[PDB]
Amino acid sequence: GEPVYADAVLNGWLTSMGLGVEYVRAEGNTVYYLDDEGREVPVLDHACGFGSLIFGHNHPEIIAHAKAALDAGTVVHAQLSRQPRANQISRILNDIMRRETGRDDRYNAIFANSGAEANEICMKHAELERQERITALFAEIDAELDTAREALTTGTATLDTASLPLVDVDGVIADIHRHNDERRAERPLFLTLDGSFHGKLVGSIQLTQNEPWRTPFTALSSPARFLPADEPELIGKIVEDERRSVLTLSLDKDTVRVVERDFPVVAAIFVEPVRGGSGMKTVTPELAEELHRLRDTLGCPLVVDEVQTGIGRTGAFFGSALLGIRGDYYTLAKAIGGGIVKNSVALIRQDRFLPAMEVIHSSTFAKDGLSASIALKVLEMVEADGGRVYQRVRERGQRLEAMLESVRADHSDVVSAVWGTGLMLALELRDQSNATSQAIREKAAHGFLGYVLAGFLLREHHIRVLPAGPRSGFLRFSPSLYITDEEIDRTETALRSLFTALRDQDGDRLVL
């Protein structure tokens, strides 16, 4: 009952899962904790800041570059002054996307401090586009109302009264202006996929499906409709139910009718090339083509969230380029801080980019000189030696995927699938809510199965894995590109061991 100032419930829960350890040092693919005698125990990290560490913990090149930047007196805080490095970083990302998509498209960069902040820059810029469309629409409706009023008062035309159910000249116009104003003030909608993860701030949390994380906060901010990635013939009808009308007067020279016109409700569509909250499921070509159709049909941007899939994780710089997702806006974060600093970027296509965004959006820490310098170092490293780092991610990915398939094949009773691509992989666990072992069943019923199994891997095999998915029903594997053959072999041994214990329903060995 001693005073506690942070993390009491978090630490309590981690301890009961078998994950209550303090990591005191990290290098490459290894984190170290202290045993009861104070000796360092090496642990293989498969979590790696949820994919932040493409080059591992504390990479010597990144550490050396950061120390040189600090010793040179880099200007970290230079707000409202010329910062050329931002333009230099945007140019590199622009060149990389042209190379990988073969499209000669140009993107403006706005920097931020987290993946959530970068996704919220996109939500905001998407809402600027929607307000432009609304102004244009309402300007036309005024002109259509003036013309109709002209025709009805002068006498040239008669008002059809079969149309009045949708709401007498001046009264009908005021009634249309009221209807349209109510509509204009309504919150927009965002479209996402089922299992989507786009961050946990007031705006972005509405775009994250995981129900315990989101549903408490529903009232704060614009909702998302979660489109079923699996059943995509249902997406058409879900979006069609979200159609909303404004009213105007249509003159067909001699007759005037009240009619509905489309109102732009949807601000943006968001998509992850590889779906973190769905267990690392890659977007299929069929789902990509449906997202393209919705973007072309609604005229709102398609925002590609590469916060996790970017900076080479999938075996290309851009996961979207590898899977043929043709986005309007793109976001990057995790790996761009080199595993030491915090940085993110929204890339917005220049033919849609509203220059007001460059001066009405800002942040104290955004575009700081230190994360800028380190971003340029990370881009230099991932681009080095004629694209060999992408080739190495692809080869390491194949090796790790092959091992995971070989484990699934012999353990199909407890593993349902292997998902993801490059070095962003996961095993799907079969439901254990009917397990013979009461301890396993109880944990699976509370959605803690994945964490319990992660605990086993830590204490028995010195391997750090974290679960994914809304019931911790997936085990994530997202190590650095320096993961060795020996470390993949040790992971295979650890998994065969874990899935043999789970098969044998050994609750005493798995659950504390």
Ligand X SMILES: *Cc1c(COP(=O)(O)O)cnc(C)c1O
Binding region for a copy of itself (CB under 8 A) out of 116-124, 319-327, 385-393, 494-502: 116-124
Nearer to a copy of itself, 23 or 482 (CB): 23
Which one of a copy of itself, ligand X, none interacts with residue 143, CB within 5 to 8 A by kind?
none
Q: Residue 11: CA atoms inside 13 Å, Cβ hemisphere, count?
A: 7
Q: What b/e readout covers 460-495, taking b as 16+ CB neighbours within 10 angstroms? A: ebbbbbbbbbbbbbbbbbbbbbebeeebbeebeebb
Two tokens, residue 374: 């380190």
**Residues in contact with ligand X by the rule CB under 6 A:** 50, 114-116, 119, 197-199, 272, 276, 305, 307-308, 333, 363-365
116 marked among binding-site residues: yes
Q: CB under 8 Å to 26, separation ≥6 — which residues?
A: 32, 45, 57, 58
CB of 238 to ligand X, least distance (A): 22
CB of 123 to ligand X, least distance (A): 12
Asked if residue 34 binds a copy of itself (CB under 8 A), the reply is no
Query: In the chain, after which residues is the C-to-N distance over 2.5 Å, breaking the chain?
Result: 167
Residue 154 has phi, psi (to 5 degrees) of -50, -40
Which one of a copy of itself, ligand X, none interacts with residue 276, CB within 5 to 8 A by kind?
ligand X
Q: Residue 210: CA atoms inside 13 Å, Cβ hemisphere, count?
A: 21
Which one of ligand X, a copy of itself, none interacts with residue 305, CB within 5 to 8 A by kind?
ligand X
Which residue, 458, 405, 403, 389, is CA-closest to 56?
389
CB of 424 to a copy of itself, least distance (A): 14
Q: Name residue, tokens 């601000």.
A: 267
Residues 91-110 vs a copy of itself: string with x where CB under 8 A?
A: x-xx-----------xxxxx
Nearer to a copy of itself, 148 or 201 (CB): 201
246 beta partners: 261
CB of 337 to ligand X, least distance (A): 9
Which one of ligand X, a copy of itself, none interacts with residue 417, CB within 5 to 8 A by kind?
none
Length of the chain as a residue count: 512
Residues 450-469 vs a copy of itself: string with x where CB under 8 A?
A: ----------------x---
Nearer to a copy of itself, 263 or 419 (CB): 263
CB of 76 to a copy of itself, least distance (A): 6
| β-pair type (189-193, 158-159) | unpaired
End-to-end CA distance of the chain: 22
Which one of a copy of itself, ligand X, none interacts with residue 197, CB within 5 to 8 A by kind?
ligand X
Query: How far from 397 is each of 30, 326, 475, 480, 486, CA to CA, in Å?
Result: 18, 24, 16, 10, 15
The SS3 call for residue 367 is coil
Asked if residue 83 binds a copy of itself (CB under 8 A), the reply is yes
115 marked among binding-site residues: yes
CB of 118 to ligand X, least distance (A): 8
CB of 362 to ligand X, least distance (A): 7
335 marked among binding-site residues: no
308 marked among binding-site residues: yes
- Distance, in Å, from the CA atom of 119 to the CA atom of 305, rounded to the nearest integer, reads 7
305 marked among binding-site residues: yes
Contacts from 394-400 at CB under 8 Å and sequence distance 24+? 394/315, 394/422, 396/423, 396/481, 396/483, 397/315, 397/421, 397/422, 397/423, 397/425, 399/485, 399/488, 400/425, 400/477, 400/479, 400/483, 400/488, 400/491
Among 139, 220, 259, 384, the residue binding a copy of itself under the rule CB under 8 A is 220
- Distance, in Å, from the CA atom of 441 to the CA atom of 307, rounded to the nearest integer, reads 34
Nearer to ligand X, 53 or 414 (CB): 53
Asked if residue 57 binds a copy of itself (CB under 8 A), the reply is yes
CB of 46 to a copy of itself, least distance (A): 12
Query: How far from 103 is each of 91, 97, 99, 368, CA to CA, in Å?
Result: 15, 8, 8, 30
Which one of ligand X, a copy of itself, none interacts with residue 493, CB within 5 to 8 A by kind?
none
Residues 117-156 vs a copy of itself: string with x where CB under 8 A?
A: x--x--xx--xx--x-------------------------
Residues annotated within the binding site for pyridoxal 5'-phosphate are: 115-116, 305, 308, 364
